[PDB]
Amino acid sequence: SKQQTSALIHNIFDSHFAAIQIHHDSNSKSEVIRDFYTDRDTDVLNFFFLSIDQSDPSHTPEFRFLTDHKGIIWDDGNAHFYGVNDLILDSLANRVSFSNNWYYINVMTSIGSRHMLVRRVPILDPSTGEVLGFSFNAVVLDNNFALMEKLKSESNVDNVVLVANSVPLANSLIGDEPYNVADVLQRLLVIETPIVVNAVTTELCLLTVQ
């Protein structure tokens, strides 16, 4: 059923981000992160994130950063790879004005547009309830191999293409099939599943092939 595949696909997408969000919530309660606001010891912070990403590769964000109440105080250096310079990072920080929610963000970079899910979480001092600042996680959807492989593998469809309106942003095509991505875009059982973030439908669609 076309609607049963569509529901399956959105459950997989949703549970991938629900796990990244659980992970982010949990690691954000670390004393190392808390203490960084006082110590500003960057060696300790980096070792800590190195350690949790080694523990969990499939749930690590593409990039992350820390703010206080004025601005970004630390970034992990990964965002630059994706065309996200300091300026664009700030704009991300400023677009995510509420905690505990994924935001879909489409920004232009010098290497093209970037399609991201970004969320923030407060870093508290548990003895005072002080909000020291915020931890951000961004997932870059563009050429996101692991997510395309999850959607394909756990739905048992043959291939997936992620599109923004209908520019292709990622796909699971090996290159040995009867069709390319352009053929898929030209609307043999291809199904459109719209991507919903924070209960609001975005410009993104998942296209499944069977």
Binding site: H69, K70, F98, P122, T128, G129, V131, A199
Partner: protein, 329 residues
Amino acid sequence: GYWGYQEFLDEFPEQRNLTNALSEAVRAQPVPLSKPTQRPIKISVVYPGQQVSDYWVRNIASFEKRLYKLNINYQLNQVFTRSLMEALKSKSDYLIFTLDTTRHRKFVEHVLDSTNTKLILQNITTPVREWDKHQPFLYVGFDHAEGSRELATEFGKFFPKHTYYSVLYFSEGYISDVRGDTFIHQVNRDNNFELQSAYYTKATKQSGYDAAKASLAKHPDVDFIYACSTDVALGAVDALAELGREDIMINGWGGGSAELDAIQKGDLDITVMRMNDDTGIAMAEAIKWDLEDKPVPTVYSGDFEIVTKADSPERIEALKKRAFRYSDN
């Protein structure tokens, strides 16, 4: 996700129609119940309680009085919280609860998915987007975001750009987001105000006190503190007295009796005063329409008035007249 109050009404013209009709019924004299019932209707209420804020208490008094005036036959049983399981069993016709924590979500979802009880959610006026298939019978309250925007507009007038402030949140959850982060965002966007510090509290006068001390011991240099609830505001008033920092302006949130007394002493500078009794009256009118097989709006928000310590005792008295028309008797 949540719809904004006006956003929801704009999205669903039928829902605006229905909310307007309810606002009008609330405004006009009680038109008693057309369809008499076979039994007395059963209502369970589960409210916070043990609060300096009189919102919940007054809400029940306003509700019962309008129910009496419409000639509704009810058995009302109430619990104030220092078990939602103990409430489930009683097989009521209308359950009145609230939604702030993810713990409330978990329960509401269970009540919506596995019961017949018509659910009224008090102190939230922003419909959950994921429930567009099966929305609660009524979301009723005074819109948190609207009240915060009003407080923000006022602060934006009293202080020049780049002014320093701190924030005392409620406990973590929905109230903190829609009162605190709404205020923070507007004042930052519009007035270039600069936030020095923010603290989540335990939603008590004690923790309101403690948080303000902690805040001021670490960031003494603010021109105002924005508080997100009544009890937290009044705790912070004490802490300011103790540290002798009445140079620091502070707000109340709700404008109940205790806030009004503090306003009149100049302990609170400003509050956003809600026309309190309207939401007790709305819930009665909503129950009546249900009993008359009439459509009932998903969402109802009451109105606010801005109150400052400069206001006449006559202005205050005329507001107490509208706001507590029922719960003052």
